[PDB]
Design an enzyme around this catalytic site. Structure first.
Site, PDB file in Angstrom:
ATOM      1  N   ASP A 184       0.091   4.904   1.057  1.00 44.75           N
ATOM      2  CA  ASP A 184      -0.130   5.806   2.190  1.00 44.75           C
ATOM      3  C   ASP A 184      -0.089   5.155   3.582  1.00 44.75           C
ATOM      4  O   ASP A 184      -0.905   4.287   3.911  1.00 44.75           O
ATOM      5  CB  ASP A 184      -1.437   6.583   1.997  1.00 44.75           C
ATOM      6  CG  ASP A 184      -1.300   7.684   0.959  1.00 44.75           C
ATOM      7  OD1 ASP A 184      -0.154   8.139   0.734  1.00 44.75           O
ATOM      8  OD2 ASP A 184      -2.323   8.094   0.369  1.00 44.75           O
ATOM      9  N   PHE A 239      -5.454  -7.945   1.663  1.00 43.97           N
ATOM     10  CA  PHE A 239      -4.713  -8.552   2.760  1.00 43.97           C
ATOM     11  C   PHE A 239      -5.221  -9.972   3.047  1.00 43.97           C
ATOM     12  O   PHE A 239      -4.423 -10.883   3.300  1.00 43.97           O
ATOM     13  CB  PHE A 239      -4.797  -7.641   3.996  1.00 43.97           C
ATOM     14  CG  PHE A 239      -4.452  -8.307   5.313  1.00 43.97           C
ATOM     15  CD1 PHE A 239      -3.137  -8.411   5.732  1.00 43.97           C
ATOM     16  CD2 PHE A 239      -5.457  -8.759   6.160  1.00 43.97           C
ATOM     17  CE1 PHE A 239      -2.823  -8.980   6.952  1.00 43.97           C
ATOM     18  CE2 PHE A 239      -5.152  -9.335   7.391  1.00 43.97           C
ATOM     19  CZ  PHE A 239      -3.843  -9.447   7.786  1.00 43.97           C
ATOM     20  N   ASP A 251       0.890  -1.144   0.000  1.00 41.30           N
ATOM     21  CA  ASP A 251       0.000   0.000   0.000  1.00 41.30           C
ATOM     22  C   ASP A 251       0.933   1.199   0.000  1.00 41.30           C
ATOM     23  O   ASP A 251       2.084   1.085   0.395  1.00 41.30           O
ATOM     24  CB  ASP A 251      -0.861  -0.020   1.255  1.00 41.30           C
ATOM     25  CG  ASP A 251      -1.587   1.284   1.490  1.00 41.30           C
ATOM     26  OD1 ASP A 251      -2.466   1.637   0.664  1.00 41.30           O
ATOM     27  OD2 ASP A 251      -1.287   1.931   2.519  1.00 41.30           O
ATOM     28  N   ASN A 281      -1.608  -0.667   5.970  1.00 41.76           N
ATOM     29  CA  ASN A 281      -1.840  -0.076   7.272  1.00 41.76           C
ATOM     30  C   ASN A 281      -3.329  -0.018   7.581  1.00 41.76           C
ATOM     31  O   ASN A 281      -3.730   0.367   8.676  1.00 41.76           O
ATOM     32  CB  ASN A 281      -1.182   1.304   7.358  1.00 41.76           C
ATOM     33  CG  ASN A 281      -1.847   2.346   6.450  1.00 41.76           C
ATOM     34  OD1 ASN A 281      -2.255   2.060   5.320  1.00 41.76           O
ATOM     35  ND2 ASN A 281      -1.965   3.561   6.962  1.00 41.76           N
ATOM     36  N   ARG A 293     -14.928  19.113  -6.613  1.00 41.97           N
ATOM     37  CA  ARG A 293     -13.501  18.844  -6.584  1.00 41.97           C
ATOM     38  C   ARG A 293     -12.590  20.080  -6.793  1.00 41.97           C
ATOM     39  O   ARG A 293     -11.419  20.069  -6.421  1.00 41.97           O
ATOM     40  CB  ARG A 293     -13.226  17.762  -7.638  1.00 41.97           C
ATOM     41  CG  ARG A 293     -11.804  17.251  -7.732  1.00 41.97           C
ATOM     42  CD  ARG A 293     -11.772  15.749  -8.052  1.00 41.97           C
ATOM     43  NE  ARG A 293     -12.218  14.954  -6.915  1.00 41.97           N
ATOM     44  CZ  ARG A 293     -11.520  14.809  -5.786  1.00 41.97           C
ATOM     45  NH1 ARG A 293     -10.343  15.412  -5.630  1.00 41.97           N
ATOM     46  NH2 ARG A 293     -12.001  14.067  -4.805  1.00 41.97           N
ATOM     47  N   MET A 347     -11.697  14.565   2.723  1.00 40.52           N
ATOM     48  CA  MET A 347     -12.556  15.597   3.270  1.00 40.52           C
ATOM     49  C   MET A 347     -13.841  15.808   2.468  1.00 40.52           C
ATOM     50  O   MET A 347     -14.881  16.131   3.053  1.00 40.52           O
ATOM     51  CB  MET A 347     -11.790  16.918   3.378  1.00 40.52           C
ATOM     52  CG  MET A 347     -10.390  16.788   3.986  1.00 40.52           C
ATOM     53  SD  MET A 347      -9.397  18.295   3.807  1.00 40.52           S
ATOM     54  CE  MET A 347      -9.939  19.175   5.260  1.00 40.52           C
ATOM     55  N   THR A 351      -2.484 -13.759  -1.348  1.00 40.94           N
ATOM     56  CA  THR A 351      -1.425 -13.021  -0.681  1.00 40.94           C
ATOM     57  C   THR A 351      -1.119 -13.472   0.767  1.00 40.94           C
ATOM     58  O   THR A 351      -2.005 -13.881   1.525  1.00 40.94           O
ATOM     59  CB  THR A 351      -1.727 -11.511  -0.702  1.00 40.94           C
ATOM     60  OG1 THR A 351      -2.857 -11.229   0.125  1.00 40.94           O
ATOM     61  CG2 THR A 351      -2.057 -11.059  -2.112  1.00 40.94           C
ATOM     62  N   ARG A 393     -13.161   8.673 -13.591  1.00 40.46           N
ATOM     63  CA  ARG A 393     -11.826   8.093 -13.636  1.00 40.46           C
ATOM     64  C   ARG A 393     -11.887   6.759 -14.361  1.00 40.46           C
ATOM     65  O   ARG A 393     -12.950   6.357 -14.845  1.00 40.46           O
ATOM     66  CB  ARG A 393     -11.257   7.937 -12.222  1.00 40.46           C
ATOM     67  CG  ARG A 393     -11.444   9.164 -11.371  1.00 40.46           C
ATOM     68  CD  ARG A 393     -10.656   9.092 -10.081  1.00 40.46           C
ATOM     69  NE  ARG A 393     -10.731  10.345  -9.339  1.00 40.46           N
ATOM     70  CZ  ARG A 393     -10.540  10.456  -8.028  1.00 40.46           C
ATOM     71  NH1 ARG A 393     -10.254   9.384  -7.304  1.00 40.46           N
ATOM     72  NH2 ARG A 393     -10.631  11.643  -7.442  1.00 40.46           N
ATOM     73  N   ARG A 433      -0.515  11.054   1.389  1.00 37.45           N
ATOM     74  CA  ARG A 433      -0.488  12.089   0.354  1.00 37.45           C
ATOM     75  C   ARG A 433       0.853  12.829   0.256  1.00 37.45           C
ATOM     76  O   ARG A 433       0.965  13.806  -0.484  1.00 37.45           O
ATOM     77  CB  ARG A 433      -1.648  13.076   0.528  1.00 37.45           C
ATOM     78  CG  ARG A 433      -3.005  12.405   0.599  1.00 37.45           C
ATOM     79  CD  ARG A 433      -4.083  13.384   1.018  1.00 37.45           C
ATOM     80  NE  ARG A 433      -5.421  12.844   0.801  1.00 37.45           N
ATOM     81  CZ  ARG A 433      -6.543  13.509   1.056  1.00 37.45           C
ATOM     82  NH1 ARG A 433      -6.490  14.741   1.541  1.00 37.45           N
ATOM     83  NH2 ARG A 433      -7.718  12.940   0.825  1.00 37.45           N
TER      84      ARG A 433
HETATM   85 MG   LIG Z   1      -3.965 -12.977   1.866  1.00 39.36          MG
HETATM   86 MG   LIG Z   2      -2.932   3.366   3.669  1.00 43.98          MG
END
Ligand SMILES: [Mg+2]
Ligand SMILES: [Mg+2]
Length: 245
Positions: free
Chosen positions: A10, A219, A8, A207, A132, A175, A224, A121, A17
């Site tokens: 961030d 996760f 990941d 995280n 935005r 936000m 994985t 997107r 960011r």
């Molecule tokens: Mg896994």
């Molecule tokens: Mg993160």
């Protein structure tokens, strides 16, 4: 012999960011002498490229770069194609969703409105009631109003009910906006392409691996080996233990 570490971005690799510490980025490259490395982030490509090097150095420092959860992919310096949200969803449902949103926001009265209420997107629609295109001061202003009033939350309750059973998932990241994307198009989307690359092991680091966080699905996926981290420093130490014991 063929292992991939997948991170990941961030809070796992970088302050959110923001830009990666040189010691982190230095470790990653050392780690690269034992394993391939890759990143998967919710942000678009340019945002990730910025946090992780100068210009397009990111696709050079990492073997894999999955932006927008892997709906957009870079593999070994090269941009791979991208399945489009409208291809996957079809025009009727996409427009149903879009028209629901325009209608709901027309009845919303805020202190300030701007532009780009609906951003299209590659693998999602970003919905933002204020728009935005507001300044940082306007982000903060709206952000504080949202906590009081639960504007995004109410909007998302109405959307979920309305499209119940139809294959849509919703967020609330940051936000001012929330995301809408096809069921499945969380971080796991990248694993399908990774399946064809013949790794013996794919380690994932995040995280937000608790239920609710945007690392949870990737996760927990049986493809994985999951790792939960609290800091970039934590991530580094974890890789020291596993790959440099
Ligand atoms: Mg896994
Ligand atoms: Mg993160």
């Amino acid at each position: 012999e063929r292992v991939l570490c997948l991170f990941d971005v961030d809070g796992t690799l970088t302050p959110a960011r923001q830009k990666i510490d040189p010691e982190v980025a230095a470790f990653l490259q050392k780690l690269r002498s034992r394993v391939q490395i890759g990143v998967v982030g919710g942000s678009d490509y340019c945002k990730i490229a910025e946090q992780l090097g100068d210009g397009d150095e990111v696709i050079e420092k990492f073997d894999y770069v999955f932006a927008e959860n892997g709906t957009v992919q870079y593999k070994h310096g090269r941009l791979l194609s991208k399945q489009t949200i409208q291809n996957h969803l079809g025009e009727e449902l996409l427009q149903d969703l879009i028209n629901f949103c325009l209608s709901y926001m027309a009845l919303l009265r805020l202190p300030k409105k701007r532009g780009t209420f609906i951003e299209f997107r590659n693998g999602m629609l970003n919905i933002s009631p204020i728009g935005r295109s507001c300044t940082l001061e306007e982000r903060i202003e709206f952000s504080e109003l949202d906590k009081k009033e639960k504007i995004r939350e109410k909007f998302v309750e109405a959307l979920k009910t309305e499209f119940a059973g139809k294959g849509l998932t919703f967020s609330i990241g940051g936000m001012i906006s929330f995301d809408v994307f096809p069921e499945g198009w969380d971080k796991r989307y990248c694993l399908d392409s990774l399946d064809q690359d013949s790794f013996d092991t794919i380690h994932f680091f995040g995280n937000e691996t608790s239920p609710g966080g945007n690392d949870f699905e990737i996760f927990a996926d049986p493809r994985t080996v999951g790792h939960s981290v609290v800091s970039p420093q934590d991530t580094v130490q974890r890789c020291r233990e596993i790959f440099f014991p």
